[PDB]
């Protein structure tokens, strides 16, 4: 099972 989770945040 491939599970990927990615996030990028600029303030």
> Least distance from C-beta 4 to its own copies, angstroms?
5
CA distance 11 to 2: 30
| Residue 4 dihedral angles phi and psi, to the nearest 5° | -120, 140
CA distance 8 to 1: 24
State the number of binding residues for its own copies (CB under 8 A).
11
- Among positions 1-11, residues that touch its own copies (CB under 8 A) are 1-11
> Least distance from C-beta 11 to its own copies, angstroms?
5
Q: Where does this chain bind its own copies (CB under 8 A)? A: 1-11
């Amino acid at each position: 099972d491939l599970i990927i989770k990615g996030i990028s945040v600029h303030i």
